[PDB]
Amino acid sequence: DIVMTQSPESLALSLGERATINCKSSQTVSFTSNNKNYLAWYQQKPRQPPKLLFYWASTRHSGVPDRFSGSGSGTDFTLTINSLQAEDVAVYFCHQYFSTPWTFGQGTKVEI
Amino acid sequence: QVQLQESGPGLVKPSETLSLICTVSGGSITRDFWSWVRQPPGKGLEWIGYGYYRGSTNYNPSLESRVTISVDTSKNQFSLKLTSVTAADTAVYYCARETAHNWIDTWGQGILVTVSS
Amino acid sequence: FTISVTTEILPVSMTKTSVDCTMYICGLLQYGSFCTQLNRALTGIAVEQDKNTQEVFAQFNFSQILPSPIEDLLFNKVTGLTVLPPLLTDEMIAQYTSALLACTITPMQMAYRFNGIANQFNSAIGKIQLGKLQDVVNQNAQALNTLVKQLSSNFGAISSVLNDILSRLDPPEAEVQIDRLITGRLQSLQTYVTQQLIRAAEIRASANLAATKMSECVLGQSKRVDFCGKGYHLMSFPQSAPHGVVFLHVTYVP
Ligand SMILES: *[C@@H]1O[C@H](CO)[C@@H](O)[C@H](O)[C@H]1NC(C)=O
Numbered sequence: 001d002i003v004m005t006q007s008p009e010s011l012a013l014s015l016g017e018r019a020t021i022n023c024k025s026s027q028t029v030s031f032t033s034n035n036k037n038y039l040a041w042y043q044q045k046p047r048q049p050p051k052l053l054f055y056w057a058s059t060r061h062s063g064v065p066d067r068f069s070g071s072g073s074g075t076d077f078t079l080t081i082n083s084l085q086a087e088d089v090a091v092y093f094c095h096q097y098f099s100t101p102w103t104f105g106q107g108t109k110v111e112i
Numbered sequence: 113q114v115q116l117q118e119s120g121p122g123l124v125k126p127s128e129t130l131s132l133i134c135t136v137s138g139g140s141i142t143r144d145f146w147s148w149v150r151q152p153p154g155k156g157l158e159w160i161g162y163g164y165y166r167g168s169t170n171y172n173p174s175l176e177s178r179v180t181i182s183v184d185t186s187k188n189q190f191s192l193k194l195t196s197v198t199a200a201d202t203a204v205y206y207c208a209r210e211t212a213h214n215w216i217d218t219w220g221q222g223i224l225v226t227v228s229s
Numbered sequence: 230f231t232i233s234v235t236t237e238i239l240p241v242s243m244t245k246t247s248v249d250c251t252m253y254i255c256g257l258l259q260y261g262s263f264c265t266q267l268n269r270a271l272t273g274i275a276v277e278q279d280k281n282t283q284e285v286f287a288q289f290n291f292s293q294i295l296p297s298p299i300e301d302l303l304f305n306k307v308t309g310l311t312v313l314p315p316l317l318t319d320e321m322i323a324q325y326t327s328a329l330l331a332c333t334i335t336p337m338q339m340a341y342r343f344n345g346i347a348n349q350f351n352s353a354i355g356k357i358q359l360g361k362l363q364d365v366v367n368q369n370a371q372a373l374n375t376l377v378k379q380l381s382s383n384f385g386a387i388s389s390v391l392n393d394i395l396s397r398l399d400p401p402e403a404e405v406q407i408d409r410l411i412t413g414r415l416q417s418l419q420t421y422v423t424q425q426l427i428r429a430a431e432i433r434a435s436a437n438l439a440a441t442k443m444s445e446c447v448l449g450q451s452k453r454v455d456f457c458g459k460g461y462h463l464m465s466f467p468q469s470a471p472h473g474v475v476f477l478h479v480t481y482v483p
Pocket of ligand 1: 289290291292351352355
């Protein structure tokens with residue numbers, strides 16, 4: 001059981017500036033031999049199904065603008081919404097698929 | 113383009129089986145694993161478990177003794193049957209298509225189920 | 230103006246261990262040479278442990294010391310993935326330590342050794358009648374048990390059996406699941422290999438210390454004080470121990 005925490009919560013960021021969301025894992029979520037991070041980043045819009053933004057915590061999905069950039073190392077993981085706009089208002093969360101059970105993040109709501 | 117749509121009763125009696133059927137439109141159902149993630153009101157998303165059309169299945173450890181999931185290829189659907197539904201199971205359900213490495217690609221418009229009366 | 234006997238404990242080897250990657254991954258046909266490198270490191274540790282014994286061994290009554298109640302007391306008080314038998318058996322090392330004890334025991338040796346009291350010596354021998362041996366044995370046993378437990382773990386896959394996944398999942402997903410399983414098992418084997426490397430280094434330090442003692446502290450005289458014995462040094466009496474060495478240093482103090 002891996003406890004996944006979103007230290008930044010309720011990010012009230014205006015237009016044209018950057019919002020940073022940090023995901024912290026209880027332990028490592030990447031195989032030492034492969035050094036491949038088994039973490040993903042999703043966003044959820046109100047009255048709308050969530051969308052896959054990032055998988056492997058670095059690689060980007062299809063339809064995700066260049067604004068979102070994800071990275072991390074072992075436990076700490078960072079998602080930066082460069083040049084945040086009104087389209088980026090949503091609840092962003094992190095998912096681990098390293099070992100069952102697969103706990104998500106508490107969800108950080110990015111408000112304008 | 114893979115779309116997932118949930119269906120089932122919005123109200124389920126306490127200590128009665130909760131049946132939620134997710135129908136997949138587009139793509140195919142015999143391609144990836146199928147999870148039934150859950151979000152309680154004001155709580156983080158909880159992964160209930162992912163099935164498979166072959167009959168393969170992996171529950172959440174906390175809900176292994178009460179969850180059961182069955183994938184039907186003939187009707188191109190997969191259903192979650194949550195047994196022994198208590199008062200804390202009131203939540204929204206998202207049927208998801210977990211890929212080969214088991215990260216969700218499509219999440220589906222979840223359905224809210226509550227227990228009352 | 231009194232002599233005393235001090236017991237010194239020094240581990241020289243632990244349980245032999247090795248892995249077979251052709252069988253470890255499956256009872257992916259060949260994931261990579263990473264497991265082969267791990268096996269090479271483990272067999273290097275095995276050769277090091279086989280060489281440490283040769284580094285330390287084969288390099289007023291005395292009934293208690295010279296046979297061997299002390300050796301029996303240490304034997305019974307102190308308790309892929311194949312544990313190889315040690316190259317030097319217990320009776321090989323017993324013969325070697327008995328022979329070296331006979332060499333170093335030959336009351337005229339007391340007279341000659343005074344240049345650098347039977348009741349005091351007898352009392353010091355008697356009051357003697359192993360912690361680090363238990364430490365290393367329990368530690369390697371826990372290491373192997375933890376490695377087996379990690380082997381039983383699914384490591385995020387859907388099962389702990391490769392054949393079950395093959396019979397249960399399609400190839401395009403069974404290969405991913407088997408990759409996860411094998412990567413996790415090789416991560417556990419890497420943890421075992423690095424822990425065995427560091428502990429082999431720590432046991433090699435003690436084996437070199439014991440070899441130095443067996444070269445100068447038991448052969449002739451230890452002119453250097455506080456190395457072995459509480460004070461000035463007369464002679465030492467080695468004792469074979471399970472995965473270790475016991476010294477009985479006879480010291481002289483004012
Ligand atoms: C050796 O001497 C000890 C006392 O130092 C005595 O208890 C023991 O019985 C003796 N052994 C023999 C075989 O005489």
